[PDB]
Scaffold this active site. Structure first.
Site, mmCIF file in Angstrom:
data_model
loop_
_atom_site.group_PDB
_atom_site.id
_atom_site.type_symbol
_atom_site.label_atom_id
_atom_site.label_comp_id
_atom_site.label_asym_id
_atom_site.label_seq_id
_atom_site.Cartn_x
_atom_site.Cartn_y
_atom_site.Cartn_z
ATOM 1 N N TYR A 191 0.821 -1.204 0.000
ATOM 2 C CA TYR A 191 0.000 0.000 0.000
ATOM 3 C C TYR A 191 0.860 1.260 0.000
ATOM 4 C CZ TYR A 191 1.185 0.707 4.884
ATOM 5 O OH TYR A 191 1.864 0.929 6.059
ATOM 6 N N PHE A 233 2.219 10.060 3.772
ATOM 7 C CA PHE A 233 2.723 9.840 5.121
ATOM 8 C C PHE A 233 3.244 8.434 5.375
ATOM 9 C CE2 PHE A 233 -0.506 7.226 7.192
ATOM 10 C CZ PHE A 233 -1.569 7.340 6.322
ATOM 11 N N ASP A 234 2.918 7.455 4.535
ATOM 12 C CA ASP A 234 3.426 6.102 4.711
ATOM 13 C C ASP A 234 3.250 5.336 3.410
ATOM 14 O OD1 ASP A 234 4.568 4.138 6.693
ATOM 15 O OD2 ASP A 234 2.782 3.011 6.100
ATOM 16 N N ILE A 280 -5.784 -0.361 11.725
ATOM 17 C CA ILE A 280 -6.971 0.473 11.844
ATOM 18 C C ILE A 280 -8.111 -0.180 11.076
ATOM 19 C CG2 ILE A 280 -5.715 2.578 12.279
ATOM 20 C CD1 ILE A 280 -5.655 3.175 9.381
ATOM 21 N N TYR A 307 -8.120 7.152 13.069
ATOM 22 C CA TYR A 307 -7.338 7.588 14.217
ATOM 23 C C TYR A 307 -8.087 8.491 15.187
ATOM 24 C CZ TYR A 307 -2.734 5.639 13.227
ATOM 25 O OH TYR A 307 -1.668 4.785 13.067
ATOM 26 N N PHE A 345 -5.835 5.561 1.109
ATOM 27 C CA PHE A 345 -4.884 4.482 0.884
ATOM 28 C C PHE A 345 -5.053 3.904 -0.513
ATOM 29 C CE2 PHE A 345 -5.435 4.480 5.517
ATOM 30 C CZ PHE A 345 -4.120 4.582 5.920
#
Lengths: 331, 780, 386, 107
Positions: free
Chosen positions: D26, D36-37, D56, D82, D99
């Site tokens: 992902y 961010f990731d 999550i 979150y 995502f």
């Protein structure tokens, strides 16, 4: 594990190899200057750079003279290179003297004397490996009464007006230790009970006899050769705001040593046979007192009326009387 | 980002942003490192590392950021663990030899078989999708093989390029080109990522001729600037450390079979002596005296054959084995043309640098001369290393690894500010170290690691940070004190190494004395443990320290207890609770192993009589009542509330009556133990008679007799017969009578039959009868 | 010990006095201290008089004298220059430390703070001149800057000075937002944080948030960032609380610090034709073409491959494609001059809108996209496959 | 809570189930487009087990609704990713996450 510890203590530690003279000659050789081709300001040699680094570290203002791993190492190397050590002829005696002069020049041409003075001044009167190595290096440089080194040290002291040097010297003088009948009897009781700690033999009696001898030999070498300038400067410093009487401090330490020697004499008076460790302590104290006596004799040897008057008005007479008593009854 | 070479404002701001990124994650902030892994990614880091048009400041910043985020923590851990050699004994360790083959040629540093214990290398995968929250231990992951390959390739390219002295270095300066790259290489080498082949390649890059394994110049002969010279000095320092580690491991490997031969031989000699003990008892005695010595002395005198020394009974075969190994070790150390050796290479390079340039960096001068001295004094490395060398069996390897991990955690926490979470973490580490078996079974390893020194560094950090105002984190002080007490108790040598810090502990002895439930975890308790049951240390005690303790006791006897008067306790003019602990420490000082120490006893008695306020309100004189009157008054105070408790659970209850009674009992016990011995009294030592007379003047006989005659309170079984036991923290405990009797026997003594019979009538006999009456099983 | 000194008719036996000379530097520093106390007390009294009652007359306000004395004191508390010899630098550093110690023991830090506080009751130079006249109004900012510089020089490099100022740090930080005091307060705070650990022990979350707000509302100043760096670690010891606060209050915003990413290079290719519509022009207004993709790897690198097809417009009869960058990063639809289709979205002006189509999927191998352009009624249409 | 639309079709029938390990690969962006990731950056697929509160649950539900070999875009509201606390240092409070998830394998 026990074998490793014993091997380290007996074989590795006892290994001795001599490299100091070769190392310092290599450091002193400038080398490849025309290949460098710069020659802008007559570049300094590696030994000079090292001495400058140590001198700058000493001159840097600090509350306490921090121990220097490097300063131990290189001060010991320098002193060993300096000394570089039956009936012998005058020719070879003079050869050895000239070799010693050259070896001392190799260091004092690069600021070694100023480094020694700076480190002693920065010691601030606290005994330690710093000042021990510094005193050993100073003795090595000043062996034989080096007039050039004496002149350099005196000139540096007079120009810098260093009251801290004499203050720290005096502080070390009081910090020097003497015989200890208490904690000698404690050691005797420990031996009587029979089990000894893993630490080496108790040296609490005359904690630093080598350090005391080094300090007083350094003073003797400062005054060596009937150098009236040092002989008077130690008694009083004209250009300084504060003066310290090194002669009187030496007298005080001699009196303390005489009192301690009399204490052991009285302890061993009743006992017919002298114990081995008591003989050890007596020998060490005799060596220290002999060094102090030599230092005073060097203070006054070349006629120095001021030092003679200071000794006459000092407490030297009581120490001499006690020493005469001890000498007679030990005889 | 390549456009920043002409935008100075953004360049400076981004460089300082990278500096802040390094700072926030500095010193093992794994959570912040994981957070920063989002803002700066692995591809961005690799691109910044590899790009050649990168501005110098940004290049240095990104190299530093990569090192700090992904490598700094483990690099620091390994570099801290470096100066300690713990070599487990396995067949792999035994297989280690000084030289690769018969030809005595030094191998390349680093490569080979090394079995010394090293910290475990662990990383956590950065993933913000997960919610495990357990990834904040260990640094974030990074491709180590890719990083190592890139580092080797870039260093090779830099060596090939800078040899031409081009005007276009990466970053615009030779410093910007080399310092970050060499720093990254040094960090990787410290981490030990490089294998044998990569080590060979990069050592060829560093110096081709010296490190060649059987025009082109290495990094050492390249006319380097000062920072690059400093980095190269660090690299050579690490190479020398690797050589020293290899030497230590080889020494241990030889020591295995050498000790195996010695131990079997000593058994043979002892068996021969036992078979032939019959010529003479005296001859048997002084020929078995070698076996009667401690094992350390046995080892020493078995090794005492280096030069002549016929006193050593070691046979010539074993002697020749040791001599051959020693000669091999000296040859390896270099004690006894191309340089072909690291020692020469370093020596000539340092001398050449020093005589080629006047070095303007004192740090560089110090590093170069330290390296030169280390090259010349090869013996000193072993001299400093062998005390830090310890060997263990295979069964203890996992426990030793766990203990080393805990010690590393504590030492790392030494470098961060003291906080609540830090206190929790290091308390947990100390507890784990307690629960580890190696801590109990290997005191010498513990002392070599110097764990007590780290614990006391923590203690000093907590205390000296304004302990005069208020002691923050007292739980941490209690835990450190407990650790140091256990360290004292484990071994006698640990006790001696602990005794060196008596002055600081006595200076801070007033930290938590007046607070109960933390007894045994105060610096005074640590000092008492250091002096405990050790005649040598008790004799080594000194009048200045004893006078400090006596002054503290006098202050307690003169002034009240501030925490107690603040908490609500009645304000009496003295501090029995704090005075009792000083009395206990003096008792430990003067009494050791069932016998009194005459010097300490005399000094303590002299100080106490110089300062008479130490005896309390009573026994002081000038309006002070007798000891019996004081004890009765304290009994009444304990019985009556609003005088014993605060009246505004053991933290809130101090039981002042019991405090006073216990203080007086402790003082009496200390005086009784300080009293001289009966044979010395018969001998007639004027000091001994003086001490006895002083104690008799202090304590009247009638007071002791009355206190012994004071009645107790026995439990009752009423209202269905359930046992009603009176609380002892407030009552008259029999330990007070025990102290009374100890003083009575030691000082006064009972010799007259009339006195003995009167004392039996008025004293012990009621207690004996009551004890007999308490024979009921429930009451018993 | 505090033994009172009196006169007696006969005295005591132990009434002798020894005399110890004072160094010339100490004497000069003491006289400078007296002069500065006098002048600053005059200045404070004048400021208080103006604040209490705006007489604007019969009040000294020695503006020129205060400015000259501030310049002299700044020169007096100057660190030795780096090109000087080592021993001379050591002597000058010792002299500076002695001067700072004497000033602190006489309490001049509090005097400087009082002068700064009295000057800060006026927001602007015009506001100060409203009560003091143009000369004082003009010199107000200069005097404030000189006072802050003097404070920084007084407490710089002295651990005792910074430890004593630690208690006054909060009052200092309370006026970060004032423009006239920002630089001086920042420098003083940086010095205190660098020197005294007690400064870090006193600094709390609110002060860190105020510093970050200074960054947010004043621009990109690297000195504030250096102050944050000093807050993070000091003397090799890290403050985990400060690190966590700085991280959680600065990083997640992504609105103040410059952000970095790796972006694939994007290349645009066009045929040789040029389609335009104008009144009376001979150019046909309807055009059609196709693009068939033979191969496309979704992820050559860590970032998705960029593939867009469509029409781009020139800027006023110029062969240069209007808008956009020449080098890379941007493709078709990343400007208001181009209109592209990536398989899922319609790109124009760097904004993407999802478009529905049968078997909605990103462009993949063996895909044909038909593009239609109409200029009679301006319209661009797409047909994926048929 | 999570809202999903395709990018590259999967097999259409093979779905995550009881007690299975989804190996996805992902990349994560905030609603403003900032990344961010990404597992692609680390060059390692992300393995996570179904129904065991490891991720999550917006991501969990998106992966569950996906098919084998599929690529999808998942939008997760703050209440499902979150909350109002955010993730300290990377995700700000009340942030909608996006995502691009590819279901590489099931095991």
């Amino acid at each position: 594990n026990l074998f490793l510890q014993g091997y380290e203590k007996s074989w590795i530690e006892t290994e001795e190899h001599y490299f100091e003279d070769k190392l310092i000659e290599d450091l002193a050789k400038p080398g490849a200057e025309p290949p460098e081709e710069d020659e802008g300001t007559k570049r300094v040699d590696p030994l000079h750079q090292l001495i400058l680094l140590f001198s700058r570290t000493a001159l840097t203002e600090k509350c306490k003279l921090e121990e220097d791993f490097l300063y131990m190492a290189y001060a010991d190397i320098m002193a060993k290179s300096c000394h570089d050590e039956e009936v012998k002829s005058f020719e070879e005696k003079e050869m050895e003297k000239q070799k010693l002069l050259y070896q001392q020049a190799r260091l004092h041409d690069r600021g070694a004397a100023e480094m020694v003075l700076q480190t002693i001044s920065a010691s601030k009167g606290e005994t330690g490996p710093m000042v021990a190595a510094t005193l050993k290096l100073g003795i090595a440089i000043l062996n034989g009464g080096n007039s050039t080194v004496q002149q350099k040290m005196l000139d540096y002291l007079k120009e810098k007006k260093d009251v801290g040097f004499f203050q720290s010297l005096a502080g070390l003088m009081q910090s020097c230790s003497v015989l200890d009948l208490n904690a000698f009897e404690r050691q005797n009781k420990a031996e009587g009970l029979g089990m000894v700690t893993e630490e080496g033999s108790g040296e609490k009696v005359l904690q630093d006899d080598e350090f005391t001898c080094d300090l007083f030999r350094f003073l003797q070498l400062l005054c060596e050769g009937h150098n009236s300038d040092f002989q008077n400067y130690l008694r009083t410093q004209t250009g300084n705001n504060t003066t310290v009487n090194i002669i009187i401090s030496t007298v005080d330490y001699l009196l303390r040593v005489q009192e301690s020697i009399s204490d052991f004499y009285w302890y061993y008076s009743g006992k017919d046979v002298i114990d081995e460790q008591g003989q050890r302590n007596f020998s060490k104290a005799i060596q220290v007192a002999k060094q102090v006596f030599n230092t005073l004799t060097e203070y006054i040897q070349g006629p120095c009326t001021g030092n003679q008057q200071s000794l006459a008005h000092s407490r030297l007479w009581d120490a001499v009387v006690g020493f005469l008593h001890v000498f007679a009854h030990m005889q | 980002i390549l456009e920043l070479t002409e935008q100075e404002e953004l360049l400076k701001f981004h460089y300082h942003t990278l500096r802040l990124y390094s700072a926030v994650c500095a010193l093992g902030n794994h959570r912040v490192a994981h957070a920063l892994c989002s803002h700066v990614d692995e591809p961005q880091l690799l691109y910044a590392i590899e790009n050649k048009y990168m501005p110098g400041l940004l290049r240095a910043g990104y190299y530093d950021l990569l090192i700090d985020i992904h490598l700094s923590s483990y690099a620091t851990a390994r570099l801290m663990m470096n100066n300690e050699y713990i070599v487990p004994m396995t067949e792999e360790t035994k297989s280690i030899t000084l030289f690769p083959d018969e030809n005595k040629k030094h191998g390349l540093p680093g490569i080979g078989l090394s079995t010394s214990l090293r910290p475990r290398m662990q990383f956590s995968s950065p993933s913000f999708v997960s919610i495990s929250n357990e990834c904040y231990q260990y640094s974030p992951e990074f491709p180590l093989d890719i990083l190592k390959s890139k580092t080797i390739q870039m260093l090779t390219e830099a060596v090939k390029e800078g040899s031409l002295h081009a005007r276009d270095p990466v970053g615009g300066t030779t410093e910007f080109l080399f310092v970050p790259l060499i720093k990254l290489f040094y960090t990787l080498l410290i981490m030990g990522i490089f294998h044998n082949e990569d080590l060979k390649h990069i050592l060829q890059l560093i110096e081709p001729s010296v490190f060649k394994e059987a025009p082109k110049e290495g990094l050492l002969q390249m006319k380097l600037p000062e920072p690059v010279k400093l980095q190269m000095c660090l690299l050579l320092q690490y190479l020398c450390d690797c050589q020293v580690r290899h030497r230590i491991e080889a020494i241990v490997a030889f020591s295995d079979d050498f000790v195996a031969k010695l131990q079997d031989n000593q058994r043979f000699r002892y068996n021969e002596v036992m078979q032939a003990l019959n010529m003479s008892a005296a001859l048997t005695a002084r020929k078995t005296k070698e076996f009667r010595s401690p094992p350390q002395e046995q080892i020493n005198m078995l090794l005492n054959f280096k030069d002549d020394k016929s006193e050593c009974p070691c046979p010539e075969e074993i002697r020749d084995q040791l001599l051959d190994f020693h000669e091999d070790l000296m040859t390896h150390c270099g004690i006894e043309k191309k340089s072909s050796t690291l020692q020469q290479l370093i020596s000539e390079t340092m001398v050449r640098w020093a005589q080629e340039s006047v070095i303007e960096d004192p740090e560089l001068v110090r590093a170069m001369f330290v390296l030169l001295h280390r090259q010349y004094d090869g013996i000193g490395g072993l001299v400093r290393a062998l005390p830090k060398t310890y060997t263990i069996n295979g069964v203890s390897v996992e426990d030793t690894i766990n203990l080393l991990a805990s010690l590393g955690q504590i030492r790392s926490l030494l470098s961060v500010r003291m906080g609540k979470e830090e206190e929790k973490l290091m308390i947990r580490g100390l507890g784990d170290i307690m629960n580890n078996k190696v801590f109990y079974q290997h005191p010498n390893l513990m002392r070599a690691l110097g764990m007590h020194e780290t614990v006391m560094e923590v203690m000093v950090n907590v205390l000296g940070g304004g302990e005069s105002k208020e002691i923050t984190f007292p739980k941490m002080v209690a835990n450190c004190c407990r650790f140091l007490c256990y360290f004292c108790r484990i071994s006698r040598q640990n006790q001696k190494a602990m005794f060196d810090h008596l002055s600081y502990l006595l200076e801070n002895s007033s930290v938590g004395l007046a607070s109960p439930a933390m007894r045994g975890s105060t610096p005074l308790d640590v000092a008492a443990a250091s002096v405990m049951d050790n005649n040598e240390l008790a004799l080594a005690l000194r009048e200045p320290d004893l006078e400090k303790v006596v002054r503290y006791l006098a202050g307690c006897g003169l002034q009240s207890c501030q925490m107690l008067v603040s908490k609500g306790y009645p304000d009496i003019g003295w501090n029995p609770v704090e005075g009792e602990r000083y009395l206990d420490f003096l008792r430990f000082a003067v009494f050791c192993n069932g016998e009194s120490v005459e010097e300490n006893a005399n000094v303590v008695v002299r100080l106490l009589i110089r300062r008479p306020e130490c005896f309390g309100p009573a026994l002081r004189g000038e309006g002070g009542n007798g000891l019996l009157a004081a004890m009765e008054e304290a009994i009444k105070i304990a019985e009556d509330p609003s005088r014993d408790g605060p009246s505004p659970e053991e933290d809130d209850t101090i039981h002042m009556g019991n405090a006073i009674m216990t203080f007086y009992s402790a003082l009496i016990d200390l005086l009784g133990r300080c009293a001289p011995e009966m044979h010395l009294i018969h001998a007639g030592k004027g000091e001994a008679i003086r001490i006895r007379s002083i104690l008799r003047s202090l304590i009247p006989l009638g007071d002791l007799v009355g206190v012994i005659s004071i009645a107790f309170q026995m439990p009752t079984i009423a209202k269905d017969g359930n046992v009603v036991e009176p609380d002892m923290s407030a009552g008259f405990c029999p330990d007070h009578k025990a102290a009374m009797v100890l003083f009575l026997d030691s000082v006064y003594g009972i010799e007259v039959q009339d006195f003995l019979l009167h004392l039996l009538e008025v004293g012990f006999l009621p207690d004996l009868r009551a004890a007999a009456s308490l024979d009921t099983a429930a009451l018993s | 010990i505090q033994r009172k000194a009196i006169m007696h008719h006969e005295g005591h036996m132990d009434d002798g006095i020894s005399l110890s000379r004072s160094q010339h530097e100490e004497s000069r520093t003491a006289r400078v201290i007296r002069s500065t106390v006098f002048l600053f007390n005059r200045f404070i009294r004048g400021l208080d008089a103006l604040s209490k009652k705006a007489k604007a007359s019969t009040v000294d306000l020695p503006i020129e004298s205060v400015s000259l004395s501030l310049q002299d004191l700044i020169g007096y508390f100057h660190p030795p220059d780096e090109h000087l010899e080592h021993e001379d630098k050591q002597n000058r550093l010792r002299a500076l430390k002695n001067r700072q110690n004497l000033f602190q023991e006489e309490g001049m830090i509090n005097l400087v703070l009082e002068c700064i506080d009295r000057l800060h009751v006026y927001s602007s130079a015009a506001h100060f001149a409203d009560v003091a006249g143009r000369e004082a109004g003009e010199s107000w900012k200069s005097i404030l800057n000189s006072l802050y510089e003097l404070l920084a020089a007084l407490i710089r490099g002295n651990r005792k000075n910074c430890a004593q100022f630690s208690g006054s740090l909060d009052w200092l930080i309370s006026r970060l937002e004032r423009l006239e005091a920002s630089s001086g307060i920042l420098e003083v705070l940086h010095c205190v944080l660098v020197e005294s650990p007690e400064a870090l022990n006193i600094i709390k979350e609110g002060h860190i948030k105020s510093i970050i707000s200074l960054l947010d509302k004043h621009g990109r100043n690297h000195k504030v960032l250096d102050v944050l760096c000093s807050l993070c670690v000091c003397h090799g010891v890290a403050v985990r609380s400060n690190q966590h606060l700085i991280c959680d209050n600065l990083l997640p915003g992504r609105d103040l610090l410059l952000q970095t990413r790796l972006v694939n290079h994007v290349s645009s290719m066009r045929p040789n034709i040029f389609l335009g519509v104008s009144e009376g022009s001979a150019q046909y207004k309807k055009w059609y073409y196709e693009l068939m993709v033979d191969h496309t790897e979704p992820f050559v690198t860590a970032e998705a491959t960029h593939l867009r097809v469509g029409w781009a417009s020139t800027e006023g009869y110029s062969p240069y494609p209007g808008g956009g960058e020449e080098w890379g990063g941007n493709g078709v639809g990343d400007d208001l001059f181009s209109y592209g289709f990536d398989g899922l979205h319609l790109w124009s002006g760097c904004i993407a809108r999802t478009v529905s189509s049968p078997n909605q999927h990103l462009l993949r191998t063996d895909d044909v996209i038909s593009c239609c352009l109409d200029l009679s009624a301006p319209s661009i249409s797409f047909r994926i496959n048929g | 809570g999570v809202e999903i639309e395709t990018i590259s079709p999967g097999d259409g029938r093979t779905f995550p189930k009881k007690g299975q390990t989804c190996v996805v690969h992902y990349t994560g962006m905030l609603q403003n487009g900032k990344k961010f990731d990404s597992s692609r950056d680390r060059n390692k697929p992300f393995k996570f087990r179904i129904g065991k509160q490891e991720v999550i649950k917006g991501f969990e539900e998106g992966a569950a609704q996906m098919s084998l070999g599929q690529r999808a875009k998942l939008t997760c509201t703050p209440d499902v990713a979150y909350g109002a606390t955010g993730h300290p240092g990377v995700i700000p409070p009340n942030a909608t996450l996006i995502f691009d998830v590819e279901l590489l394998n099931l095991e």
